[PDB]
Amino acid sequence: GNREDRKAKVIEVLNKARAMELHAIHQYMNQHYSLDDMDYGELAANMKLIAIDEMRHAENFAERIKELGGEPTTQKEGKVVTGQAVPVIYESDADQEDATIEAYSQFLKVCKEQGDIVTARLFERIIEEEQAHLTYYENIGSHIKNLGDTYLAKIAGTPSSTGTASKGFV
Amino acid sequence: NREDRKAKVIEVLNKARAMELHAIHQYMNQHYSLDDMDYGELAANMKLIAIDEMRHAENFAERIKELGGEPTTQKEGKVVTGQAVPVIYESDADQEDATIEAYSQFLKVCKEQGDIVTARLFERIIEEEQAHLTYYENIGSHIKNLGDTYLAKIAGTPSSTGTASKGFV
Amino acid sequence: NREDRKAKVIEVLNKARAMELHAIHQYMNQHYSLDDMDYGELAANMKLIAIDEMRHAENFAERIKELGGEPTTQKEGKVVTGQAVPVIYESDADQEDATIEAYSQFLKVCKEQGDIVTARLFERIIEEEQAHLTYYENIGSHIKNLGDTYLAKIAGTPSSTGTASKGFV
Amino acid sequence: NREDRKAKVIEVLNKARAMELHAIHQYMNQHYSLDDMDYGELAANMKLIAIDEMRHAENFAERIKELGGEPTTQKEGKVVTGQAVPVIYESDADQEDATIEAYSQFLKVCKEQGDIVTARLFERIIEEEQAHLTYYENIGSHIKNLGDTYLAKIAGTPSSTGTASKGFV
Amino acid sequence: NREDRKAKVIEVLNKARAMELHAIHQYMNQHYSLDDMDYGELAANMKLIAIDEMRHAENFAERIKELGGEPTTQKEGKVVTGQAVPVIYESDADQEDATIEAYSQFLKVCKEQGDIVTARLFERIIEEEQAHLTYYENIGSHIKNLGDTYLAKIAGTPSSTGTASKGFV
Amino acid sequence: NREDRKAKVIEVLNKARAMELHAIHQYMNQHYSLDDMDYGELAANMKLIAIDEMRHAENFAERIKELGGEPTTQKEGKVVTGQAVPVIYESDADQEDATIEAYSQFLKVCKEQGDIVTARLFERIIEEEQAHLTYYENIGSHIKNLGDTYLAKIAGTPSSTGTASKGFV
Numbered sequence A: 001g002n003r004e005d006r007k008a009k010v011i012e013v014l015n016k017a018r019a020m021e022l023h024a025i026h027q028y029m030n031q032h033y034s035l036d037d038m039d040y041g042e043l044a045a046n047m048k049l050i051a052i053d054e055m056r057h058a059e060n061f062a063e064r065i066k067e068l069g070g071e072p073t074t075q076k077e078g079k080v081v082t083g084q085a086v087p088v089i090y091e092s093d094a095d096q097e098d099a100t101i102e103a104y105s106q107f108l109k110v111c112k113e114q115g116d117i118v119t120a121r122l123f124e125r126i127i128e129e130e131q132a133h134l135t136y137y138e139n140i141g142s143h144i145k146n147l148g149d150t151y152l153a154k155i156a157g158t159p160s161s162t163g164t165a166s167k168g169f170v
Numbered sequence B, C, D, E, F: 001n002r003e004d005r006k007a008k009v010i011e012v013l014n015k016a017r018a019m020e021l022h023a024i025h026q027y028m029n030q031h032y033s034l035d036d037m038d039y040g041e042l043a044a045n046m047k048l049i050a051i052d053e054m055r056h057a058e059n060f061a062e063r064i065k066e067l068g069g070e071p072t073t074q075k076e077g078k079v080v081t082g083q084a085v086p087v088i089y090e091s092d093a094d095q096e097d098a099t100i101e102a103y104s105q106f107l108k109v110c111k112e113q114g115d116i117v118t119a120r121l122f123e124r125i126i127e128e129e130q131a132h133l134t135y136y137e138n139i140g141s142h143i144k145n146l147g148d149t150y151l152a153k154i155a156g157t158p159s160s161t162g163t164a165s166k167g168f169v
């Protein structure tokens, strides 16, 4: 289609992806608070670090949406599942990252269809980061499945720090 | 006694966290606009304040967990988009003021319920909200009183908030 | 005057009765939750104490009739739903304590009105409420000091309160 | 969807439960009067029918819990007091007849929402309401057709409903 | 058509029977593992539910024979092995829920084909499946909320389901 | 070695269990027909023998678990349906004979693998299969020698195998 139409179709998949990120941020941070509460430090820490990757994805999608003339969404897609036990956390996050990669690859095809190279490349890079998340989650899930409590005993009491504090305003 | 007290504090903690979640999205939205407008300094500071609200959201969640509750994932209120520069600063000062007002009452509940740790948490965050309020009031005043000469000075400034986010990848 | 002495005692009996009707709904509400949760012995004793409150309600009504009045059908206050197990026992203890205080005052009115039979009725029921209070305090103390290890013991226990309600059908 | 079908059944379950709570209070009110009038066998059967409704109210509440809902604690409508013996059996019949009509409709909703278990629960309770209906129409007919000649035979009969309520104390 | 009405019902009867054959092997597989882990009460009840499934399979076959059909000997789906304890009670609950959904559809086919006797069979068995579902949910809830503290209680319990097989030798 | 000795025995145990699963379905299929034909004593005894096979399948499964294995859920071969009464008893005699042959080879492996306990399990079960074999040969002999005169005697006889199999519901 025309210039405006081309931007609009891409703005639409960008807002769908971004809404998926917003969901991931809250879901992963929800699991983070639980892991932290259970005092599984290394697990709690990497979960937050992955939530921060999703915050960056959300921001990148937003910045591209503005560059195309659109308005970045503020609504998350789907609802957050709370109270998941450890094995459910890792099995569900693996499923969610898989679904994400599936959807983002369809979104990339749309960008290519609309002749938007820059946005297509954005999705490409982010899909590669989602793959890292998927592999991480699959591996934790696999050890939980195969090694049970004996694997968890080693994470118990480990540091949970994600580094120096959030460069903020105050 | 104890059980009732805990439940009442968890309720105000979640109300506050819900307000933090609103603020994160509202400020980041305005941050995208300022960046798009290329007012770097305003863009940068708006995001840094958004990261303060993220840390508030997280401190509330952690206290909620310590008290046996579940931290909410829904924001309070709707995000307003398309605000022009004068409206951004007038509204944000209004939001910060209202936030301090509500948190002050939340604080009071914590004291009535005998929860000193949660009261101290609110106290600390309220002091950080006062800093946000003052910042927004100040930008608002210079936009009211000086416009362009002031905005031309912000035009083209760096919008970097420092080194990139420690993440997983 | 005989009629005013009766009117005055019927008044406190209906207040008491309304409190019983509340307690029936409140404790049975909790019973449905404990059953759902499959905490058998706890569900069963909760319902057994509710049945005590039904009996109280019944005895208050029969004395009211004896005095020429009309037993009320409205419960005092409202029932709290969705209470978690720690809150169930803390609040139920609270409620029994408040009942004994209330009833201790109603008994005073009876004596003041020269009604020995109603006064003895309140005295007999008050001792039963003491038994309810001690029970709830005891469970409350176990859930506080032992938490999930105590509940693990109750998990899956029988929830029978004996033979089913003899009824009409 | 699954949650929509459960919510719709919970709604008609809560309506029915509110009708049961009302029947419990209405019929026990009459029981207090019949006992006061010293018509023991009428009073005893009235209380046994109220206990049937208590058991219906409990069954509905348990099924509501199984479906994830919250059982109501509010009765439907208002309790009429001070009814005379002819009015008692005339209105109890009307009420039983109206409950069977409503429950037949509630049953239809369960089926529409594909809830077999709840349909059979309504089905079984309707057959018990029918036994209540028949009892009230029969007593009502004797009071209307025979009056005092018939009541003379009930005067001073036993009112016991058997061994008293297993309770907590 | 008389023959076609029977044919359609026999088809849903064979489909339900195939689900029953599956449940039998799936539950007994988990029974062998729970016994292997020496959680007697859980192993025992798991095997008692399997035996309920054997009886449903048998009742379906008998109705199929009455209708002139041939009872299937293939199970629907495959058995999952090596499940961990939380997975056992999560899947069985899911499987009981799915069974109820289907049997209610099967019931509708019988009514449409005007087979009252078969519909009534499905109705009764659906009530039994609901008792199974409730059981699995309760165990999975205790494993979820109490973990090993609950299992410690079960460890080393008797696994007896009673007197042995009334068989031929 | 120890594991390989266990693995070889698990293999013949699972082969035996697959044969039991087949006999259960094969014999119950014939039980369904015999009942439909209303030859009760024959239908009763066929079901009783299938319950014996159920027990064998269970003992094999239990032994497999003891050796670290997974009990198979797949049956050996196919169920033949629609067999005439004479074919039923000739084939089952033939099936029992072959099982004893196979079982006797399986016992050998146990001994070669140094597994005394599993060899003794096969030994006790082989004695039961011989009881089954004699039974089936006896009936085939009456059908061959006496035909319809034998069946006239069994027609309308009781088919019960006892009170229902105690289950969960």
Ligand code: FEC
Pocket (backbone or CB within 6 Å): A025, A026, A029, A030, A052, A055, A056, A058, A059, A062, A074, A162, A164, A165, A166, A167, B021, B024, B025, B026, B028, B029, B051, B054, B055, B057, B058, B061, B073, B164, B165, B166
């Ligand atoms: C971008 C973006 C969004 C999307 C908002 C939108 O509406 O577009 C975004 C959204 C969220 C939201 C929700 C939450 C709240 C989640 C919850 O509590 O459930 C949420 C929570 C946090 N983020 Fe977040 N954010 N965010 C960054 C960017 C974005 N953030 C950058 C950058 C940093 C910088 C990290 C640093 O260096 O300290 C960063 C850090 C945090 C920390 C870590 C703070 C600490 O440990 O001190 C927490 C907690």
Ligand code: FEC
Pocket (backbone or CB within 6 Å): C021, C024, C025, C026, C028, C029, C051, C054, C055, C057, C058, C061, C073, C165, C166, D024, D025, D026, D028, D029, D051, D054, D055, D057, D058, D061, D073, D163, D164, D165, D166
């Ligand atoms: C269930 C349930 C409810 C509904 C509460 C809810 O919110 O779901 C429930 C509600 C009430 C309410 C009001 C009253 C008060 C009636 C009035 O005074 O108007 C009320 C009254 C009575 N109930 Fe009650 N019910 N109910 C049982 C179950 C429930 N009942 C079971 C079971 C038994 C067992 C029968 C026995 O063995 O005595 C039992 C017995 C009684 C007796 C008999 C005491 C005695 O004779 O010693 C009286 C009076």
Ligand code: FEC
Pocket (backbone or CB within 6 Å): E021, E024, E025, E026, E028, E029, E051, E054, E055, E057, E058, E061, E073, E163, E164, E165, E166, F024, F025, F028, F029, F051, F054, F055, F057, F058, F061, F073, F161, F163, F164, F165, F166
């Ligand atoms: C063990 C075992 C298996 C193998 C499953 C596995 O994968 O390990 C086993 C498998 C099967 C299978 C198929 C069927 C279905 C037959 C068919 O319809 O083809 C099958 C069918 C039945 N079993 Fe069964 N089972 N099972 C016992 C043990 C085992 N069961 C025990 C124990 C009892 C207990 C009876 C008692 O003494 O009370 C018993 C009884 C029955 C009854 C009798 C019901 C009644 O008369 O009420 C029927 C029908």
Ligand SMILES: [Fe+2]
Pocket (backbone or CB within 6 Å): A021, A024, A053, A054, A057, A058, A126, A130
């Ligand atoms: Fe992402």
Ligand SMILES: [Fe+2]
Pocket (backbone or CB within 6 Å): A024, A054, A097, A100, A129, A130, A133, A134
């Ligand atoms: Fe991701």
Ligand SMILES: [Fe+2]
Pocket (backbone or CB within 6 Å): B020, B023, B052, B053, B056, B057, B125, B129
């Ligand atoms: Fe804040």
Ligand SMILES: [Fe+2]
Pocket (backbone or CB within 6 Å): B023, B053, B096, B099, B128, B129, B132, B133
């Ligand atoms: Fe602020």
Ligand SMILES: [Fe+2]
Pocket (backbone or CB within 6 Å): C020, C023, C052, C053, C056, C125, C129
């Ligand atoms: Fe009481």
Ligand SMILES: [Fe+2]
Pocket (backbone or CB within 6 Å): C023, C053, C096, C099, C128, C129, C132, C133
């Ligand atoms: Fe009490």
Ligand SMILES: [Fe+2]
Pocket (backbone or CB within 6 Å): D020, D023, D052, D053, D056, D125, D129
């Ligand atoms: Fe009723």
Ligand SMILES: [Fe+2]
Pocket (backbone or CB within 6 Å): D023, D053, D096, D128, D129, D132, D133
């Ligand atoms: Fe009724």
Ligand SMILES: [Fe+2]
Pocket (backbone or CB within 6 Å): E020, E023, E052, E053, E056, E057, E125, E129
């Ligand atoms: Fe079944």
Ligand SMILES: [Fe+2]
Pocket (backbone or CB within 6 Å): E023, E053, E096, E099, E128, E129, E132, E133
């Ligand atoms: Fe079942």
Ligand SMILES: [Fe+2]
Pocket (backbone or CB within 6 Å): F020, F023, F052, F053, F056, F057, F125, F129
């Ligand atoms: Fe066998």
Ligand SMILES: [Fe+2]
Pocket (backbone or CB within 6 Å): F023, F053, F096, F128, F129, F132, F133
């Ligand atoms: Fe055999």
